[PDB]
Design a protein around this ligand. Sequence first.
Ligand SMILES: [Mg+2]
Ligand SMILES: [Mg+2]
Ligand SMILES: [Mg+2]
Ligand SMILES: [Mg+2]
Ligand SMILES: [Mg+2]
Ligand SMILES: [Mg+2]
Ligand SMILES: [Mg+2]
Ligand SMILES: [Mg+2]
Ligand SMILES: [Mg+2]
Ligand SMILES: [Mg+2]
Ligand SMILES: [Mg+2]
Ligand SMILES: [Mg+2]
Ligand SMILES: [Mg+2]
Ligand SMILES: [Mg+2]
Ligand SMILES: [Mg+2]
Ligand SMILES: [Mg+2]
Ligand SMILES: [Mg+2]
Ligand SMILES: [Mg+2]
Ligand SMILES: [Mg+2]
Lengths: 119, 121, 203, 50, 145, 116
Amino acid sequence: AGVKAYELRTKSKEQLASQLVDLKKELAELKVQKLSRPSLPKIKTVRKSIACVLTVINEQQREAVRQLYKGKKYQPKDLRAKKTRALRRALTKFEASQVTEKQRKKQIAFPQRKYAIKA
Amino acid sequence: KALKVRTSATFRLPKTLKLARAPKYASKAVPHYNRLDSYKVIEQPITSETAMKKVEDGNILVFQVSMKANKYQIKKAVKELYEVDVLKVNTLVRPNGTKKAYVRLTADYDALDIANRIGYI
Amino acid sequence: GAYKYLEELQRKKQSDVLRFLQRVRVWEYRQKNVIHRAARPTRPDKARRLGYKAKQGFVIYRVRVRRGNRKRPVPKGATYGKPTNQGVNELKYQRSLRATAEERVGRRAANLRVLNSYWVNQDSTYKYFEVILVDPQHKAIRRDARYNWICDPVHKHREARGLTATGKKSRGINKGHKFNNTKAGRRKTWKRQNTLSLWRYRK
Amino acid sequence: AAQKSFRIKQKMAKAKKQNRPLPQWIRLRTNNTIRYNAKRRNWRRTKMNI
Amino acid sequence: AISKNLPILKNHFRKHWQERVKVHFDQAGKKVSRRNARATRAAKIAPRPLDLLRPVVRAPTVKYNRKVRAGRGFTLAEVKAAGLTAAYARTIGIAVDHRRQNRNQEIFDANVQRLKEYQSKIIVFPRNGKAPEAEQVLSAAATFP
Amino acid sequence: DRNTAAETFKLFNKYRPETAAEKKERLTKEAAAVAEGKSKQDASPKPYAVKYGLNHVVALIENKKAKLVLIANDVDPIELVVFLPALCKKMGVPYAIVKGKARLGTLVNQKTSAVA
RNA sequence: UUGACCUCAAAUCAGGUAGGAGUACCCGCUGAACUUAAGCAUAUCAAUAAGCGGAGGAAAAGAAACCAACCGGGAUUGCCUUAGUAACGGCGAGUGAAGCGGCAAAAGCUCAAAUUUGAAAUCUGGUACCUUCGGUGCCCGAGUUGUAAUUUGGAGAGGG
RNA sequence: GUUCUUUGUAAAGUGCCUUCGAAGAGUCGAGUUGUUUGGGAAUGCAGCUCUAAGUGGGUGGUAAAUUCCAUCUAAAGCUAA
RNA sequence: GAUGGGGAAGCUCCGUUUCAAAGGCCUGAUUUUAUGCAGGCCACCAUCGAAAGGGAAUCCGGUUAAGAUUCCGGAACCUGG
Ligand SMILES: [Mg+2]
Ligand SMILES: [Mg+2]
Ligand SMILES: [Mg+2]
Ligand SMILES: [Mg+2]
Ligand SMILES: [Mg+2]
Ligand SMILES: [Mg+2]
Ligand SMILES: [Mg+2]
Ligand SMILES: [Mg+2]
Ligand SMILES: [Mg+2]
Ligand SMILES: [Mg+2]
Ligand SMILES: [Mg+2]
Ligand SMILES: [Mg+2]
Ligand SMILES: [Mg+2]
Ligand SMILES: [Mg+2]
Ligand SMILES: [Mg+2]
Ligand SMILES: [Mg+2]
Ligand SMILES: [Mg+2]
Ligand SMILES: [Mg+2]
Ligand SMILES: [Mg+2]
């Protein structure tokens, strides 16, 4: 059982918030009934449903922030790339490709020609 | 021309204007949801026969509470979830590592009536 | 320009004008901290010859280091060995003072890369150097392919490994017969010359 | 030490939970090689040294 | 120590030599990798012969001067005599050395005439157009022994 | 002398290099002239301005082109300009020691110029 | 009085950046002793072990202030060889490279030191826009105590 | 291979004649001390003292003077296999 | 035992007010308004270090299988606002 992720994504934040506070309610009363019956595996689906809603709530919030910071430098660090420490510090392909005027003229004038040795 | 009059042979660092932080971007840009919710500070009552004695006799409720919660939160949460005023709160750390809360309700309310309303008696 | 004049004039260290400047300047550097930021190079020609340029990301630090030998850090001079190794007072510290000045500056400002250093003044107890430091994170240095080579992580702490002008001199790496022991690395060659190579078919 | 620090009392709780025999249903799993709780401790023979 | 009528031996095995022992178990494996490297290198430069034309030149060291040996580069004075610039030649496949000079004519013209066959024996593809198929050979040295 | 210094600054102020703004409009006029007059960038008259720049001026005296030069007395490596008065004396170029590199800097729309 | 410059500070000032781990290999510093010499101090073990500082997938070295003495070769690196040789050594024990030759792979180069002076032509940053590993406009700033273009010795520059 | 931009009155290369041709300093080098090397009147490195020149400087494995010759061009820097 | 500093190649060492430009304290103004200007004031200048040293304030009766100067009943006190 439990709530599925895809149909939650069609909701809004207030509906999700109402869903969450409702979800936390039964987990309370399932927990008090857990000590009554010898076993109750139904609580597992309840807790997972809370996680699914919480992920959905977070997912919507970040995307709206991403749209807010779209198209301008200095985005929040957690929304940046998490490749490595080294790669983030590495030279970008633009700056690595930069070359002085003296060398650019030599490359354009004298590139490595394609030659064949048969005759 | 003239010099500033100094009436103290000790020189101290001048007071300069201090700016206020105006970050170009937010730190995390998504504020964390409330870490310690009323549903998280209290999770389940304690149904030991000794605990049941306090409920029926002393008008005292018993709960297991998160170790991060203090008496202010416990009193705040109980009157929230159960809409019942709290006289005083006693807390202790059980030998198994969990926190046990002794909540005493005002005489205007009955602990036994609240207990079975929760679903245990 | 006037760089030729300033370079030629500097070679006359015993002239009246230079020694007067040397006398005045050496007093000033003692007054300030052991390591302190220098607004502009003392010898603009000498710095730019070593690689300095007048733009953002180029930093000059002034450092003074104590002259003399290296006393053996041993309690009361008792070495506990054969008489060959009992020497304490006349030890020499194979690395140059110019090198150890670069290392201390590099530690102070780890966000910059050490390039070169040069002598500016000296006295009985201290020797004074100015070090050329380059900021790799500055955009004006990330661009300008003439200098973006320093941004590559392989050149972290050149002075610590001895990749500066002084380090290679101290490491003794040069072409020639006089540098047989240290031509491709003192320890590298030693491992080569002390490695027994065996093939599948013994020769 | 009746008057003890919370850190010691936190190590207290885990030791209480550790001291418990093997659950019986562990016996019945397929390819079960665990015979008993080998890491059992008792206050008379072994001290925690915490 | 000294026992019989045996010759004196000099066995330098007093250091911790066991820690530095290289046995070339990977001889066969390394050889295959080299051949694989050559094939892959050939593929990326398909029309090119994988090596540059080296000059013919006389050996030093009167023990060896009777023999002739391949050189490194083509002595800028030589390539000028061949009628092309050093910049162009190195873009074509002629190695150029700027620190060896000409002191024997018999070497000089042989290297000069060596270039003139190579200029005749190669097809330089236009930088823009059709680039005819090559049917590459893998070594210019074998072309011009 | 400050009376002499005041007079020469009055002279030099009339010969000041073009600012960033007026340079921008200047080249646009030449661009306009190129478009229609096709003049080889010589529609503008010959410019008259004070020559500044330490390396720039030093080469000028060596070619005996500088009519008059000025020296800042407060250059924080003094060795940058110690030789220069002798150099002008050898070349016969008149020179003047003047107070204030900042005063020169204002003369050339900069902070410090140390020579004019 | 007002406004600059130079030097030096303060900001939870706008952006960044360094620290620790691993360490087989790599770049340096520091640095023994057991042992051998049938004793033992120089020596040897050893420019090693331990300790300390610093990177990358390789590092380091690298395009001669070279090797050579020949009809000269020609960056660096590695193998076979040179060679247990020249040499060092209570010339005792012991230690001990380099040139040439064959082969593997091969790749070259750039700054300062020149006045553009008929135009600091240069660059970081902020803002706005855009097709965003960045681009354009505009605005401050850096910089003449020198950022752009050309030149790097194999040359090369100014002139006709 | 297919396509859109034409970079660009831009840039580079090549001959002849003439004038030039800037090139690294508390560095090289020398003495002493210590260490190290196979380097031996001293291979390298380091400390102290002295300390330059420009047809100059370094090397040519025996120190020194005199006279030549050869060979490179430091005390600044990047670079795969 | 940090910091300012000074040593040490370095792990780290010395030093705790020392060759430091080492700060908050309160009152009032402003009621576009939040707090900068109005002032004035002061000179130690981190921190850690005691369940027996110093230290604000609680007692009695009753209750549990096992808790109590902590729970219940009654009666007090201190600190802050
Ligand atoms: Mg308590
Ligand atoms: Mg010392
Ligand atoms: Mg010892
Ligand atoms: Mg013995
Ligand atoms: Mg024995
Ligand atoms: Mg013995
Ligand atoms: Mg070790
Ligand atoms: Mg490398
Ligand atoms: Mg390198
Ligand atoms: Mg040895
Ligand atoms: Mg040593
Ligand atoms: Mg020696
Ligand atoms: Mg301390
Ligand atoms: Mg305390
Ligand atoms: Mg106490
Ligand atoms: Mg007392
Ligand atoms: Mg009392
Ligand atoms: Mg008891
Ligand atoms: Mg009470």
